[PDB]
Design an enzyme around this catalytic site. Structure first.
Site, short mmCIF file in Angstrom:
data_model
loop_
_atom_site.label_atom_id
_atom_site.label_comp_id
_atom_site.label_asym_id
_atom_site.label_seq_id
_atom_site.Cartn_x
_atom_site.Cartn_y
_atom_site.Cartn_z
NE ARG A 50 -3.47 -0.58 2.88
CZ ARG A 50 -4.61 -0.07 2.42
NH1 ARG A 50 -5.16 -0.52 1.31
NH2 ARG A 50 -5.20 0.92 3.09
CG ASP A 106 -6.38 9.98 9.90
OD1 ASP A 106 -6.98 10.84 9.21
OD2 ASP A 106 -6.87 8.87 10.19
CE1 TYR A 117 -5.12 5.17 12.91
CE2 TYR A 117 -6.95 6.74 12.99
CZ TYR A 117 -5.81 6.25 12.37
OH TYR A 117 -5.39 6.79 11.19
N1 LIG Z 1 -5.09 4.71 3.63
C1 LIG Z 1 -5.76 5.79 4.07
O1 LIG Z 1 -6.87 6.00 3.54
C2 LIG Z 1 -5.20 6.63 5.12
C3 LIG Z 1 -3.90 6.31 5.66
N2 LIG Z 1 -3.41 7.16 6.67
C4 LIG Z 1 -2.08 6.86 7.24
O2 LIG Z 1 -1.14 6.59 6.20
C5 LIG Z 1 -0.24 5.53 6.59
C6 LIG Z 1 -0.25 4.39 5.52
O3 LIG Z 1 -1.62 3.90 5.43
P1 LIG Z 1 -2.04 2.45 4.87
O4 LIG Z 1 -1.10 2.06 3.77
O5 LIG Z 1 -3.49 2.35 4.67
O6 LIG Z 1 -1.76 1.50 6.12
P2 LIG Z 1 -2.02 -0.02 6.44
O7 LIG Z 1 -2.89 0.00 7.66
O8 LIG Z 1 -2.42 -0.71 5.26
O9 LIG Z 1 -0.58 -0.65 6.76
C7 LIG Z 1 0.20 -0.28 7.86
C8 LIG Z 1 1.39 -1.21 7.63
O10 LIG Z 1 2.17 -1.15 8.84
C9 LIG Z 1 2.20 -2.45 9.38
N3 LIG Z 1 1.85 -2.56 10.81
C10 LIG Z 1 0.60 -2.39 11.46
N4 LIG Z 1 0.72 -2.61 12.75
C11 LIG Z 1 2.03 -2.93 12.98
C12 LIG Z 1 2.78 -3.28 14.13
N5 LIG Z 1 2.20 -3.35 15.33
N6 LIG Z 1 4.10 -3.53 14.00
C13 LIG Z 1 4.69 -3.46 12.79
N7 LIG Z 1 4.07 -3.16 11.65
C14 LIG Z 1 2.73 -2.89 11.81
C15 LIG Z 1 1.35 -3.40 8.60
O11 LIG Z 1 1.75 -4.80 8.73
P3 LIG Z 1 2.46 -5.79 7.78
O12 LIG Z 1 3.86 -5.40 7.52
O13 LIG Z 1 2.43 -7.00 8.61
O14 LIG Z 1 1.65 -5.94 6.50
C16 LIG Z 1 1.09 -2.68 7.34
O15 LIG Z 1 1.89 -3.23 6.28
C17 LIG Z 1 -0.70 5.06 7.98
O16 LIG Z 1 0.16 5.55 9.00
C18 LIG Z 1 -2.12 5.54 8.11
O17 LIG Z 1 -2.41 5.77 9.48
C19 LIG Z 1 -4.15 8.26 7.12
C20 LIG Z 1 -5.39 8.55 6.59
C21 LIG Z 1 -5.88 7.74 5.61
C1 LIG Z 2 -10.22 6.58 5.28
N1 LIG Z 2 -10.22 5.19 5.66
C2 LIG Z 2 -9.35 4.33 4.83
C3 LIG Z 2 -8.16 3.74 5.56
C4 LIG Z 2 -7.76 2.32 5.30
N2 LIG Z 2 -6.54 1.82 6.01
C5 LIG Z 2 -5.97 2.60 6.99
N3 LIG Z 2 -4.88 2.17 7.64
C6 LIG Z 2 -4.30 2.91 8.62
N4 LIG Z 2 -3.35 2.38 9.39
N5 LIG Z 2 -4.85 4.12 8.98
C7 LIG Z 2 -5.97 4.63 8.36
N6 LIG Z 2 -6.50 5.80 8.71
C8 LIG Z 2 -6.59 3.87 7.34
N7 LIG Z 2 -7.68 4.34 6.71
C9 LIG Z 2 -11.34 4.56 6.34
C10 LIG Z 2 -12.27 5.36 7.04
C11 LIG Z 2 -13.33 4.77 7.72
C12 LIG Z 2 -13.44 3.37 7.82
C13 LIG Z 2 -14.52 2.78 8.65
O1 LIG Z 2 -15.41 3.45 9.20
N8 LIG Z 2 -14.52 1.44 8.77
C14 LIG Z 2 -15.50 0.53 9.36
C15 LIG Z 2 -16.24 -0.20 8.25
C16 LIG Z 2 -17.25 0.65 7.47
C17 LIG Z 2 -18.21 -0.18 6.63
O2 LIG Z 2 -17.77 -0.79 5.63
O3 LIG Z 2 -19.41 -0.23 6.98
C18 LIG Z 2 -14.87 -0.48 10.33
O4 LIG Z 2 -15.61 -0.99 11.21
O5 LIG Z 2 -13.65 -0.77 10.23
C19 LIG Z 2 -12.56 2.55 7.09
C20 LIG Z 2 -11.51 3.14 6.35
#
Ligand SMILES: NC(=O)C1=CN([C@@H]2O[C@H](COP(=O)(O)OP(=O)(O)OC[C@H]3O[C@@H](n4cnc5c(N)ncnc54)[C@H](OP(=O)(O)O)[C@@H]3O)[C@@H](O)[C@H]2O)C=CC1
Ligand SMILES: CN(Cc1cnc2nc(N)nc(N)c2n1)c1ccc(C(=O)N[C@@H](CCC(=O)O)C(=O)O)cc1
Ligand SMILES: NC(=O)C1=CN([C@@H]2O[C@H](COP(=O)(O)OP(=O)(O)OC[C@H]3O[C@@H](n4cnc5c(N)ncnc54)[C@H](OP(=O)(O)O)[C@@H]3O)[C@@H](O)[C@H]2O)C=CC1
Ligand SMILES: NC(=O)C1=CN([C@@H]2O[C@H](COP(=O)(O)OP(=O)(O)OC[C@H]3O[C@@H](n4cnc5c(N)ncnc54)[C@H](OP(=O)(O)O)[C@@H]3O)[C@@H](O)[C@H]2O)C=CC1
Ligand SMILES: NC(=O)C1=CN([C@@H]2O[C@H](COP(=O)(O)OP(=O)(O)OC[C@H]3O[C@@H](n4cnc5c(N)ncnc54)[C@H](OP(=O)(O)O)[C@@H]3O)[C@@H](O)[C@H]2O)C=CC1
Ligand SMILES: CN(Cc1cnc2nc(N)nc(N)c2n1)c1ccc(C(=O)N[C@@H](CCC(=O)O)C(=O)O)cc1
Ligand SMILES: CN(Cc1cnc2nc(N)nc(N)c2n1)c1ccc(C(=O)N[C@@H](CCC(=O)O)C(=O)O)cc1
Ligand SMILES: CN(Cc1cnc2nc(N)nc(N)c2n1)c1ccc(C(=O)N[C@@H](CCC(=O)O)C(=O)O)cc1
Lengths: 247, 247, 247, 247
Positions: free
Chosen positions: C12, C140, C153
């Site tokens: 991702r 975020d 979170y």
């Molecule tokens: N995607 C979005 O829509 C949004 C993302 N963000 C922020 O952007 C960043 C990237 O997002 P996104 O790619 O969705 O994130 P993901 O949640 O998909 O991935 C986070 C990654 O970090 C690893 N990870 C999670 N927990 C742990 C842990 N305890 N120890 C070590 N590794 C861990 C995962 O494990 P593993 O290596 O095992 O696969 C994973 O590959 C994040 O910090 C998120 O908070 C903010 C707003 C929105």
């Molecule tokens: C913007 N975002 C995408 C997205 C995906 N991976 C992430 N990963 C990380 N670590 N941090 C994030 N902020 C993050 N966010 C979102 C925002 C809201 C919900 C949410 O309300 N989820 C419900 C499911 C909603 C539904 O499908 O009804 C849940 O219970 O997890 C999910 C993803």
């Protein structure tokens, strides 16, 4: 007895502020622009409770060549009637849309910036130059999530926020506290149809209800009181969690 | 009669808060960790004024396997003693430097994050599950201008502000308000030399004085009162303009 | 040639960042926890384009007695393999609900606070003590409008925001910049049904689309570049106006 | 080829911006008020590099009966000369003290508010009606810590901030991005004595140096570039951590 000046204190929230302060020993100057009759009914009602404890004052707060003098007289009114002015509440505010994409725009920035920003600045200046002194500006908790179509009003309120902090710092040596109260959803427009009003209330996390004028008065009352003697330059939000709601 | 829990309430600001609430009909639970003598003197002093109006409760709020169970009991104490809990004040807080560049760092995050952020979370969680209900968190107005060397403390306070807004929204439907009071410069460390203390006070724009425990307790008393019934998720800054001063 | 550590860089957004920085001369350390396969493929694919320009590193960032040592090794890894470390991207982040009202809560706080806040802190600390150096934290933008149910979170990310400003100030004298990029709506959960996904994209003002990993990586590339050499302690929001939409 | 309008672009930061954008293939409309000489040397200099690439435009941006039409002509100038306008950089800005306690005040609010907020509003409004389109407003990172005596300027900039977010949301559907760059300490006043200048530089955490004009143009070039295609409504701070510095 301390004196307070409430701009736009003839109706709604402003009316509730004027009454609350009066119920606490304050002699109030009730300013208005057009609600002359509502203003008189309030002043009479207050003097009936305490002779000579309320006076009237008319004045438009829009940008104009006469704004600076009008603000000077509104404060001067407190001194002429009570010989003092301890509290200023900037409640008067023009509010309506001004869409970027399709009354003159110039006249709109004049009325919106005048009442919500520039008048307050001229009022504070006049208030500070003629001196538990404190100013309380009425902000809007929601201007951080701009209401579509109220561009000018939003800028005006942001400017007022800058005034609250700028003034707070410059008047600290003069022992004049400058704060703000920021309502979220309070008294809805009187013409607004009930079903629309109900769609608005349903959005409030805490009780799905708008803030009553009294609840807003309560916050202002706290900030003017001695219980806030160390509080200056802060904005007190009163929105029932509305600003926290995700779209 | 409503009951209130006050963490770290044996001395300083917590003490002042416990006394203020009690003077208002509140049956307070004084929580403490090391200040056992002060806690006993406060409870005895309070019961003397109203039998069975105060009780004691010891507990470390650092991160550990026991923290969750500990926070449950601390809330349970209010119920065992008064059959209710209406107010929670998260006052307890560890505070000391943790410089990035040169007690174990692990143990420091355990104590700084537990008392300032994680315990409050567990406490709020317990308080809500066992239900004018309101929670008030003690934040820090200066954390936006990070005190060099207090990185971990700063992160903890930021987590706490995050909790204030997340909890306010999740608990609105349950009619529990969650706010915070943010002091700027209040009770200085007792061991800090007077001259250093004087240099700190001189920085406060409003009066060149720190806030007294009573001025902090005033704001708190306001937020738990019915005069704040529409206020939730807000942070009340009580810093006399300190955060506004330019370096 | 400079070296960069990207936590959670196997898939991702983290994956996209590893590739962008690599296409720019950076020698990357791809860290991961469970995504071992994805990490191996990525590393191989990068070494294919440039031999010895990528290395792997496994490590759990949950709160633990080993966390501190783990974070030390993760940074040490970059030095072992490249003899240097110029950029740290704290991307790793656990994400899921922890509802206040009804996996152990304690284990949830350990994982959410560990990966989103404490690990980054230990990582930054290790990064600094072993020294165009800069750190970029993934924040975020929507945490200001607490997503109901993601309380822990949310606190963690606020802590991360506090760390960004605290580290930036403490590390300025060491010539290490510390910034953050805050996505709003980006890569959605792969398992989320299409309709739900479409409902989320509709909420974005700018294009009714979510941010692509590449757009998030572009912002990151800018803050690590020399074109941002005077930028530290700032948070760059990349949300397409999402945080501006009124509920 | 795209066209960009740069208000106050004859010298300092504005000059740096015009050049940068020009070096990227932009045709620029260089607006000025009194720096007529510098404006002509800049435009000829740019036209020497590329014939018909730069044009001049003089005007005052203070509040007035003519402001609206003046802003209309400044945008129109871009269309007459280039048949298009893709980028608008609101750099022009009046800056000087207006102490609350003892040139006319009315005149001051007209020049300070006109150039820093109202003019920008009319430019953006004109720029949108006549349509990678983006607007970049120049803010001030330090306006949160109000400079004593610059009350009016501070309000004006705060209003500029509200406009950035208001405009960003309303213009998203029109595919026009609106962002801002906020310097802290950049080019000092030319007449300022060196020792004073040095005292100011010393306060900057990162390098103890003010931001060069180029460093500011970098941030602007980034927000206008396609590398920020998903960014709108955001303010990019470029202050070397100055705003984090505790008084
Ligand atoms: N995607 C979005 O829509 C949004 C993302 N963000 C922020 O952007 C960043 C990237 O997002 P996104 O790619 O969705 O994130 P993901 O949640 O998909 O991935 C986070 C990654 O970090 C690893 N990870 C999670 N927990 C742990 C842990 N305890 N120890 C070590 N590794 C861990 C995962 O494990 P593993 O290596 O095992 O696969 C994973 O590959 C994040 O910090 C998120 O908070 C903010 C707003 C929105
Ligand atoms: C913007 N975002 C995408 C997205 C995906 N991976 C992430 N990963 C990380 N670590 N941090 C994030 N902020 C993050 N966010 C979102 C925002 C809201 C919900 C949410 O309300 N989820 C419900 C499911 C909603 C539904 O499908 O009804 C849940 O219970 O997890 C999910 C993803
Ligand atoms: N009600 C709500 O839901 C919310 C209110 N607020 C803020 O709270 C404050 C009070 O709000 P609310 O009671 O609804 O306000 P109203 O809009 O009802 O009243 C404002 C008052 O000020 C006066 N006024 C308007 N324009 C001018 C002007 N140009 N010169 C002089 N007086 C003028 C009015 O005229 P007149 O004297 O002729 O009657 C009126 O009495 C305002 O500052 C508003 O911005 C913020 C968020 C929400
Ligand atoms: N004083 C000031 O100038 C300012 C204070 N604040 C905030 O105001 C609040 C009150 O401040 P102040 O009275 O000075 O605080 P103190 O630091 O004096 O006291 C905090 C109290 O909580 C207790 N405590 C500390 N760590 C733990 C722990 N791990 N477990 C259990 N209890 C613990 C203490 O122990 P014990 O009960 O054993 O004595 C102490 O009584 C705090 O949240 C602080 O962060 C914010 C800005 C300024
Ligand atoms: N320099 C710094 O340290 C900092 C700058 N900023 C912001 O960055 C931007 C650029 O700053 P800087 O280059 O120092 O600004 P300057 O004050 O040097 O220049 C502003 C420019 O706009 C013009 N101008 C001033 N008043 C008016 C008016 N009423 N109508 C039309 N034009 C006017 C000037 O006149 P003319 O064309 O006659 O020369 C000048 O070219 C500004 O918006 C400023 O607020 C923010 C923080 C710090
Ligand atoms: C919270 N609020 C109430 C309200 C009442 N008087 C005020 N008065 C002032 N001075 N300032 C305010 N912010 C204010 N607010 C609002 C918010 C939005 C709309 C709004 O969307 N109005 C549309 C009408 C919406 C509809 O009915 O469909 C308009 O065209 O004005 C109205 C009132
Ligand atoms: C405003 N404040 C008072 C104070 C006292 N107890 C508290 N207790 C807690 N829980 N939290 C606080 N924020 C707190 N603050 C401060 C601010 C700065 C320093 C500080 O810089 N301390 C240096 C000592 C400075 C000196 O005297 O030289 C240290 O190393 O601890 C101390 C107290
Ligand atoms: C950071 N900055 C530089 C500076 C230069 N030109 C600008 N121009 C504009 N348009 N806006 C700015 N914010 C700006 N800022 C500053 C900040 C404060 C003072 C200030 O205190 N000025 C005193 C002089 C201080 C002294 O030398 O004693 C004055 O009375 O003008 C000067 C420059």
């Amino acid at each position: 007895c301390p004196a307070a000046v409430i701009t736009g204190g003839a109706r709604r929230i402003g009316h509730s502020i004027a009454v609350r302060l009066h119920q606490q020993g304050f002699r109030v100057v009730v300013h208005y622009r057009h609600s002359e009759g509502a203003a008189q009914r309030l002043v009479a009602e207050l003097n009936a409770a305490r002779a000579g404890s309320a006076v009237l004052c008319k004045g438009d707060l829009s940008l104009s060549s006469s704004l600076l003098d009008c603000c000077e007289d509104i404060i001067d009114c407190s001194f002429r009637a009570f010989g003092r002015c301890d509290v200023l509440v900037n409640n008067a505010s023009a509010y309506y849309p001004t869409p970027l994409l399709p009354k003159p725009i110039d006249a709109q920035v004049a009325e919106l910036f005048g009442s919500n920003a520039v008048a307050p600045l001229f009022l504070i200046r006049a208030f500070a130059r003629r001196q538990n002194l404190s100013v309380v500006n009425l902000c809007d908790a929601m201007t951080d999530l701009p209401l579509p179509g109220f561009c000018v009003y939003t800028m005006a309120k942001h400017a007022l926020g800058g005034l609250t902090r700028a003034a707070a710092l410059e008047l600290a040596p003069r022992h004049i506290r400058v704060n703000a109260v920021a309502p979220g959803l309070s008294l809805l427009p009187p013409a607004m149809p009930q079903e629309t009003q109900e769609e608005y209330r349903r959005k409030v996390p805490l009780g799905q209800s708008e803030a009553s004028a009294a609840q807003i008065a309560d916050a202002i009352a706290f900030l003017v009181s001695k219980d806030a003697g160390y509080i200056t330059g802060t904005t007190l939000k009163v929105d029932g969690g509305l600003i926290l709601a995700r779209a």
